[PDB]
Amino acid sequence: QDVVLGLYYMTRDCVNAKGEGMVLTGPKEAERLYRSGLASLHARVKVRIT
Amino acid sequence: KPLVGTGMERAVAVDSGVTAVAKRGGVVQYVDASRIVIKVNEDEMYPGEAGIDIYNLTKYTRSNQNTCINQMPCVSLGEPVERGDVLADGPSTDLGELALGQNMRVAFMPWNGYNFEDSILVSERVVQEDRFTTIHIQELACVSRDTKLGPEEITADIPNVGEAALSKLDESGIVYIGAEVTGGDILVGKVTPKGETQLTPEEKLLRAIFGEKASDVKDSSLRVPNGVSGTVIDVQVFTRDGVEKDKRA
Amino acid sequence: REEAVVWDILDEVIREHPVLLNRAPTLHRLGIQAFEPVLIEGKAIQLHPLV
Amino acid sequence: FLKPRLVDIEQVSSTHAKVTLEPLERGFGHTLGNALRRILLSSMPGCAVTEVEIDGVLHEYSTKEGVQEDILEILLNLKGLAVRVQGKDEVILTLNKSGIGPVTAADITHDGDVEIVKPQHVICHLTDENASISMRIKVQRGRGYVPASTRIHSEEDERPIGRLLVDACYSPVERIAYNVEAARVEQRTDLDKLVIEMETNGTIDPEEAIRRAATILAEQLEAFVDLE
Amino acid sequence: TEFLKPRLVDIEQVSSTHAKVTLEPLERGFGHTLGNALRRILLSSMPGCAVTEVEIDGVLHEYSTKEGVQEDILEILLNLKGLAVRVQGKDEVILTLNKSGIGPVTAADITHDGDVEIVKPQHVICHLTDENASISMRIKVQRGRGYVPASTRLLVDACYSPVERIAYNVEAARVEQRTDLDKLVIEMETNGTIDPEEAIRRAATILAEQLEAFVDL
Amino acid sequence: ARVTVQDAVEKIGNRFDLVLVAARRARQMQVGGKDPLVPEENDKTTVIALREIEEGLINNQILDVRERQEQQEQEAAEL
Amino acid sequence: EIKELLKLGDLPTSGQIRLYDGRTGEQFERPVTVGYMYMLKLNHLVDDKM
């Protein structure tokens, strides 16, 4: 119950947030952007994943 | 004092039997934890048997579910009281209301999973304030019968214990009032007579080597149950008439 | 007497020794499961949430 | 790069004070705010009542003549007693009082080392005009929160059964709240300004508190850093 | 008086550039303190050089394309955002590329400077198809702090600090006599320009210099 | 440590013969007839037995060969 | 009436304050419900059960 709520809040998208539509080199700077507060937790973003 | 009450709290507080309701109002003459002494007004007073009212409060005593039913005065010295007005709050009562628990600041949020299914998570600010620290009273009992091997004794001398285990006892073998005991301490030193040990081989060899008499008695003393603490607050000694009463009795 | 030397001994005897946890309506066979104990300052069995 | 420095301390009313801390860079406002908030709020040196010995009392589940209180509400009124100690780490105060009326902390006996920060903190009321209460309070410097169930291991031979162990809440602080707002600087555009509002019981002055807290924090970091 | 401090224990380098550092004797609640403090100082405010300016020989303005390059210039600069460069004893340097033929343009092909080190010479920049287009560019990086675009400064958008991830866990640690205490676990990934122990060391140096003024012994 | 026993299931199948083989091996290591053939990490004889299964050097067949070899050495050590 | 009583206090009308985490020190997104609930200690204490 708590874990699925944490996921459903974590993986979603609102149409306007911080860092809307920026580009990311991977998951690591996704974490550095969220935990610094520059970009929001959910904003649609092109990333590079392997 | 429940901040969100329903107004039915005063009827349950007064009209139960735990609090002390004034039967004749007046001016409060004397306030103590033991008793409350009321000077009755002139108009509410009978012509014969004049007097004043006295209300003996019930102090720390045992309830049936091992909790501590207690009464505490809520009125001060020299205060006007109405007829039918509360004077002594009982257990879980504040000022003649019904205070079953306590009111606390609550946040509804999932906090790192510690509130997973239905769990509650409490700060140390509650336990430092002792605002949920409750008082229980247990009643341990030690009976002393008459077996057909001999009668039992309540003497302080116990076989094969230390003096540090017996320093919390008196000269009569019954524990002092107000000594904090833990699990395993001896409250009532009681020994039962036994005989016919039926010792084995090499145990009988050892006895022969060291000459130690296997004693004619057995430690069946009353002990604290495994894993509690607390204070001895009240000791009673019931004795059959025709038997020597010891010193603490 | 619970002297201070027995807690290292107890941590030696726990380390890889599974205990069985059981809830009373044991309907299907996942009602009894083993675990490895981690010792707790407390009096309540801590039980993993996903289980 | 640019290091901070403390500036005006504002005792607001009596016992809670706003400590400003002006020259802080990006991010270090919230950083030092959270860090100093925690170290002030958790572990500061303070002293509280540990052992109480009332004269005519066997144990805390009892009653006394003339006192309208029970014994353990006297003990819970002594737990909230805010006191400070200058040149000792434990010291024994005492109460001797007679007559009808309130009994506050102002009636505790005189000592040059011990300062009482609230003379109106009411301990117990007396009624019968003859029932004189007389106790010996033992205050003790400490750290954090130690309940009475933890101290009783060696037990100090508690055979003087008149000793009543009180849970000692040694923490002198009650609430620490910080704001981080921008300080207008001459050439540099943004430098954050920290304001640590601190509510205490009255025993600890704020500059010494924050100096102890930053000392403890730097002592924690100097495990793998060094002197500078 | 129980102010017992920790001591560093085995910095476990897992493979190349990222290390797990545990720290066993900490009091109640200091684990999240040191974790949050070191975390925010590493992740937010480090002295660190990132990609400042990258000037290709045959590109006039940054909206262009090159012979043989399968991409356009913008996703190439997006690739260059992850370029990890260390500067040892300079405050300014200009290196250069020279790549000919069909193949990927690596960071190995950047010119040799004995001080400025590219920790990954395999760092792919763009690909080539022509075999007649000899790509060559000149790169200057310049030191900064945090995240700054070109809006305050071909001009290249960037990200300064050498750390890639800092994550801590606080978990209970039994002590021989003591009841229960915290244990700090900092797992940290850097880009390789700074070895991780020096990264945590500079973080603690910055924090202690911040606490230098009003704390004293 | 040993969180899952999956590798020992891949070496010795049937998931139930694994218990009997590891039991026999851990009795050979607890009752002091033998000593471990893998470095122990302060594990109990259970986990050491499972780790000796996962290294492949113990199964039912190797234990039978080793036990018959000990019996032959007893027959040679009768004198 | 609860809203009009909250307007007598300085509290927000929606009854949800923004809160700051004790550890990270940074604001929770989506301000949360705090209040004063009257709670009870039931006598299923653990040391009688264990």
Curated annotation (Swiss-Prot), chain A:
Post-translational modification remark: Acetylated on several lysine residues in the presence of glucose.
Biotechnology: Co-administration of salinamide and rifampicin or salinamide and myxopyronin suppresses the emergence of resistance to both antibiotics.
Record's subunit section: The RNAP catalytic core consists of 2 alpha, 1 beta, 1 beta' and 1 omega subunit. When a sigma factor is associated with the core the holoenzyme is formed, which can initiate transcription. The rRNA transcription and antitermination complex (rrnTAC) consists of RNAP, NusA, NusB, NusE (rpsJ), NusG, SubB, ribosomal protein S4, DNA and precursor rRNA; S4 is more flexible than other subunits.
Family affiliation: Belongs to the RNA polymerase beta' chain family.
Function: DNA-dependent RNA polymerase (RNAP) catalyzes the transcription of DNA into RNA using the four ribonucleoside triphosphates as substrates.
Name of this protein: DNA-directed RNA polymerase subunit beta'
Organism: Escherichia coli (strain K12)
UniProt lineage: Bacteria, Pseudomonadati, Pseudomonadota, Gammaproteobacteria, Enterobacterales
Annotated gene: rpoC
Residues of the full protein shown: 504 to 553 of 1407
UniProtKB/Swiss-Prot annotation, chain C:
Entry PTM: Acetylated on several lysine residues in the presence of glucose.
Biotechnological applications: Co-administration of salinamide and rifampicin or salinamide and myxopyronin suppresses the emergence of resistance to both antibiotics.
Similarity annotation: Belongs to the RNA polymerase beta' chain family.
Subunit structure: The RNAP catalytic core consists of 2 alpha, 1 beta, 1 beta' and 1 omega subunit. When a sigma factor is associated with the core the holoenzyme is formed, which can initiate transcription. The rRNA transcription and antitermination complex (rrnTAC) consists of RNAP, NusA, NusB, NusE (rpsJ), NusG, SubB, ribosomal protein S4, DNA and precursor rRNA; S4 is more flexible than other subunits.
Function (record text): DNA-dependent RNA polymerase (RNAP) catalyzes the transcription of DNA into RNA using the four ribonucleoside triphosphates as substrates. Resistance to the antibiotics salinamide A, salinamide B, rifampicin, streptolydigin, CBR703, myxopyronin, and lipiarmycin can result from mutations in this protein.
The name this protein goes by in its record: DNA-directed RNA polymerase subunit beta'
Span of the entire protein shown here: 403 to 453 of 1407
From Swiss-Prot, chain D:
Region annotation (Alpha N-terminal domain (alpha-NTD)) ranges: 1-227
Whole-protein coverage range: 8 to 234 of 329
Family statement drawn from the similarity comment of this UniProt entry: Belongs to the RNA polymerase alpha chain family.
Enzyme Commission (EC) number: 2.7.7.6
Source species of the chain: Escherichia coli (strain K12)
Resulting phenotype, residue 38 to C: In rpoA112; temperature-sensitive, blocks RNA polymerase assembly
GO cellular component: cytoplasm; cytosol; cytosolic DNA-directed RNA polymerase complex; membrane; transcription elongation factor complex
High-level lineage: Bacteria, Pseudomonadati, Pseudomonadota, Gammaproteobacteria, Enterobacterales
Assembly: Homodimer. The RNAP catalytic core consists of 2 alpha, 1 beta, 1 beta' and 1 omega subunit. When a sigma factor is associated with the core the holoenzyme is formed, which can initiate transcription. Both the N- and C-terminus interact with different regions of transcriptional regulator CRP. The rRNA transcription and antitermination complex (rrnTAC) consists of RNAP, NusA, NusB, NusE (rpsJ), NusG, SubB, ribosomal protein S4, DNA and precursor rRNA; S4 is more flexible than other subunits.
Domain comment as written in the entry: The N-terminal domain is essential for RNAP assembly and basal transcription, whereas the C-terminal domain is involved in interaction with transcriptional regulators (such as CRP) and with upstream promoter elements.
Regions crossing the membrane: none
Protein name per Swiss-Prot or TrEMBL: DNA-directed RNA polymerase subunit alpha
Catalytic activity: RNA(n) + a ribonucleoside 5'-triphosphate = RNA(n+1) + diphosphate
Gene that this sequence comes from: rpoA
Mutagenesis / variant outcome for changing residue 184 to C: In rpoA101; temperature-sensitive
Region (Required for interaction with Crp at class II promoters): 155-158
Curated annotation (Swiss-Prot), chain G:
Superkingdom to which the source organism belongs: Bacteria
Modified residues (N6-acetyllysine): 7
Biotechnology: Co-administration of salinamide and rifampicin or salinamide and myxopyronin suppresses the emergence of resistance to both antibiotics.
PTM characteristics: Acetylated on several lysine residues in the presence of glucose.
Assigned protein family: Belongs to the RNA polymerase beta chain family.
Known function: DNA-dependent RNA polymerase (RNAP) catalyzes the transcription of DNA into RNA using the four ribonucleoside triphosphates as substrates. Resistance to the antibiotics salinamide A, salinamide B, rifampicin, streptolydigin, CBR703, myxopyronin, and lipiarmycin can result from mutations in this protein.
Record note on quaternary structure: The RNAP catalytic core consists of 2 alpha, 1 beta, 1 beta' and 1 omega subunit. When a sigma factor is associated with the core the holoenzyme is formed, which can initiate transcription. The rRNA transcription and antitermination complex (rrnTAC) consists of RNAP, NusA, NusB, NusE (rpsJ), NusG, SubB, ribosomal protein S4, DNA and precursor rRNA; S4 is more flexible than other subunits. In pull-down experiments interacts with CedA.
Protein's UniProt name: DNA-directed RNA polymerase subunit beta
Species: Escherichia coli (strain K12)
